[PDB]
Design an enzyme around this catalytic site. Structure first.
Site, PDB file in Angstrom:
ATOM      1  N   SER A 298      25.227  22.564   1.629  1.00  0.00           N
ATOM      2  CA  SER A 298      24.173  21.724   2.176  1.00  0.00           C
ATOM      3  C   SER A 298      24.753  20.879   3.292  1.00  0.00           C
ATOM      4  O   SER A 298      25.894  20.420   3.203  1.00  0.00           O
ATOM      5  CB  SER A 298      23.617  20.804   1.085  1.00  0.00           C
ATOM      6  N   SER A 299      23.947  20.652   4.328  1.00  0.00           N
ATOM      7  CA  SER A 299      24.329  19.754   5.426  1.00  0.00           C
ATOM      8  C   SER A 299      24.646  18.349   4.916  1.00  0.00           C
ATOM      9  O   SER A 299      25.432  17.609   5.537  1.00  0.00           O
ATOM     10  CB  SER A 299      23.186  19.662   6.442  1.00  0.00           C
ATOM     11  N   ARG A 300      24.054  17.993   3.781  1.00  0.00           N
ATOM     12  CA  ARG A 300      24.207  16.641   3.211  1.00  0.00           C
ATOM     13  C   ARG A 300      25.554  16.399   2.562  1.00  0.00           C
ATOM     14  O   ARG A 300      25.936  15.247   2.349  1.00  0.00           O
ATOM     15  CB  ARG A 300      23.118  16.370   2.175  1.00  0.00           C
TER      16      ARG A 300
ATOM     17  N   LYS B 211      18.443  27.838  -3.086  1.00  0.00           N
ATOM     18  CA  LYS B 211      18.775  26.437  -3.377  1.00  0.00           C
ATOM     19  C   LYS B 211      17.519  25.565  -3.366  1.00  0.00           C
ATOM     20  O   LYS B 211      17.343  24.711  -4.227  1.00  0.00           O
ATOM     21  CB  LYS B 211      19.840  25.867  -2.442  1.00  0.00           C
TER      22      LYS B 211
ATOM     23  N   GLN C 143      27.069  30.583  16.525  1.00  0.00           N
ATOM     24  CA  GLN C 143      27.148  31.189  15.191  1.00  0.00           C
ATOM     25  C   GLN C 143      26.272  32.440  15.101  1.00  0.00           C
ATOM     26  O   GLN C 143      26.697  33.477  14.586  1.00  0.00           O
ATOM     27  CB  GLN C 143      26.759  30.193  14.105  1.00  0.00           C
TER      28      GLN C 143
ATOM     29  N   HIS D 179      23.139  29.441   5.541  1.00  0.00           N
ATOM     30  CA  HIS D 179      22.258  30.115   6.490  1.00  0.00           C
ATOM     31  C   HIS D 179      22.788  31.493   6.858  1.00  0.00           C
ATOM     32  O   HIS D 179      22.002  32.436   7.007  1.00  0.00           O
ATOM     33  CB  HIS D 179      22.093  29.307   7.762  1.00  0.00           C
TER      34      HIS D 179
ATOM     35  N   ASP E 209      26.150  25.069  19.295  1.00  0.00           N
ATOM     36  CA  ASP E 209      26.933  25.501  18.140  1.00  0.00           C
ATOM     37  C   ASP E 209      26.161  26.498  17.266  1.00  0.00           C
ATOM     38  O   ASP E 209      26.705  27.528  16.875  1.00  0.00           O
ATOM     39  CB  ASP E 209      27.379  24.299  17.305  1.00  0.00           C
ATOM     40  N   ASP E 210      24.901  26.184  16.961  1.00  0.00           N
ATOM     41  CA  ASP E 210      24.048  27.104  16.199  1.00  0.00           C
ATOM     42  C   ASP E 210      23.938  28.467  16.871  1.00  0.00           C
ATOM     43  O   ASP E 210      24.043  29.507  16.210  1.00  0.00           O
ATOM     44  CB  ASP E 210      22.639  26.532  16.035  1.00  0.00           C
TER      45      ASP E 210
ATOM     46  N   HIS F 129      25.060  26.461   8.564  1.00  0.00           N
ATOM     47  CA  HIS F 129      26.302  26.591   7.794  1.00  0.00           C
ATOM     48  C   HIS F 129      26.324  27.925   7.043  1.00  0.00           C
ATOM     49  O   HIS F 129      25.419  28.740   7.211  1.00  0.00           O
ATOM     50  CB  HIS F 129      26.491  25.406   6.829  1.00  0.00           C
TER      51      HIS F 129
ATOM     52  N   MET G  95      16.171  24.994  10.225  1.00  0.00           N
ATOM     53  CA  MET G  95      16.031  23.790  11.021  1.00  0.00           C
ATOM     54  C   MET G  95      17.308  23.521  11.789  1.00  0.00           C
ATOM     55  O   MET G  95      17.586  22.384  12.189  1.00  0.00           O
ATOM     56  CB  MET G  95      15.642  22.612  10.145  1.00  0.00           C
TER      57      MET G  95
END
Lengths: 286, 277
Positions: free
Chosen positions: B185-187, B149, B81, B46, B77-78, B43, B39
């Protein structure tokens, strides 16, 4: 890869066997055609087979599986006609090269676990009193499409709502298959071919002509508009001894959330004694 | 005519039909198509999925970036990467391209989807399985890669593939962790310093349990609970030992221990392999 004898009928029961043979055939340039059936084959099914056969380079796979998930409790699954010997004889006579005849255990090793949830159309018409029927149809058709990976899949127009829902399945899940609808094959008097016709006694068989007569009357009445078409069909059905109408509906061709315009489909379902018959026809308004 | 594909460059496609046509054409040339569904907001977690896909001989890697409304947005940015990782295909569809007829036919998961994460989010996995099924049909990969995860997601994906007879291999990739064990995690960036310190308790509880397990399942569960009980502001939603397919844990053998907790407004998940005795 199990044996495949070309120009003969090869019968496979294991999903892996047909998957392997289909893959190998496709890799050599053949185009795989799938005709999904529940057996009890009649001339309407053979029209599907012949449509598939004429695709150049075709190899034809006919699946025969009485899918328990599209039945509800109450006798229907056990009552579905099974004529395996006649089915395979007919396939041989038509020059079909592959019959896929899976077991219930091979298709449902984990019972009902992940399934297909159809859109709102599945709750209407045939699905009204049978709210899980089309979930069963779409789940098995998805599975057959993944096992066989055909280039084209063939369905009859008699079960028109089913055909529309299969087109929805294909669009909605981005399936790489062409859906081919084949016109209904009829007896000489107009009666749509169906495995259920065998349950009409001679009187019921005679009365059953009213379904196709009502529809064709409506299609010609339709130059005078929707009301004229519907009333013509209703009049023919009303004149028919022992036909009990469950619904008669004129909808847009996609049966979805849009009003009838210039092109529609008129659908009927009726009971003759305990036998439920369906039929439908294209309608052009005006 | 097949859309342009430039080998060794990042080729970006937004049309499902375009990536479908390119994927099909490439597989015919002797590539093995690897799909990594994401999605976006990429990071290191991924990137481990990407690297697992890349190492398959003959691989061409397709990374999908799609925020699935049915189940952070940095597109430039994605993509940078992905380019840096040598990914040759990014699939970046719009919601309208994925759902041109709206929500209509969908996937209904089995009963596992109502458990664990499906508690607070009872329709979440239906969304996930629906979009994953669509991506599999568009891209037709040989292998599809998911992180461990989101273990329940992975198990549900394996159910999807088995139940619908899909011809794809599902590859689960081990969780990438920060230096102290925190699952990436993005969180994580939402955690304040007190919460970030307390958050280590999830991984510490799981690793403690994995080693406690020589003394049996109860010792494992009790060790994990004790570690979580030593942390402030960690509201545990569940801590469950299950078999590897998320059925009931057998008396002996392989299992999985899963935890979820809320730290302030941030929900964290982790899980670990457990061998009993």
């Amino acid at each position: 890869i199990p044996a495949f004898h070309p120009g003969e009928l090869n019968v496979y029961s294991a999903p892996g066997d047909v998957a392997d043979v289909s893959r190998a055939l496709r890799l050599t340039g053949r185009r795989v055609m799938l005709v999904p059936t529940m057996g009890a084959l009649h001339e309407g099914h053979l029209a599907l087979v012949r449509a598939a056969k004429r695709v150049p380079g075709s190899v034809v796979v006919v699946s025969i599986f009485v899918n328990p998930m599209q039945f509800g409790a109450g006798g229907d699954l056990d009552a579905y006609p099974r004529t395996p010997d006649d089915d395979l004889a007919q396939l041989r006579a038509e020059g079909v090269e592959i019959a896929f005849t899976p077991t219930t255990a091979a298709m449902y090793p984990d019972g009902l676990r992940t399934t297909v949830q159809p859109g709102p159309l599945a709750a209407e018409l045939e699905g009204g009193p049978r709210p899980t029927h089309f979930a069963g149809v779409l789940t098995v058709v998805l599975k057959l499409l993944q096992i066989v990976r055909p280039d084209r899949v063939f369905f009859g127009e008699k079960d028109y709502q089913q055909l529309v829902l299969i087109r929805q399945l294909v669009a909605d899940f981005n399936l790489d298959v062409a859906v081919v609808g084949v016109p209904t094959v009829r007896e000489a008097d107009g009666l749509a071919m169906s495995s259920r016709n065998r349950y009409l006694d001679p009187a019921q068989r005679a009365a059953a002509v009213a379904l196709s007569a009502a529809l064709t009357a409506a299609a010609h009445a339709a130059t005078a508009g929707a009301q004229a078409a519907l009333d013509a069909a209703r009049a023919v059905l009303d004149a028919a001894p022992g036909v009990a109408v469950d619904y008669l509906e004129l909808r847009d061709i996609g049966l979805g959330p849009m009003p009838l315009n210039g092109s529609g489909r008129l659908l009927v379902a009726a009971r003759l004694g305990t036998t439920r018959l369906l039929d439908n026809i294209a309608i052009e308004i005006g």
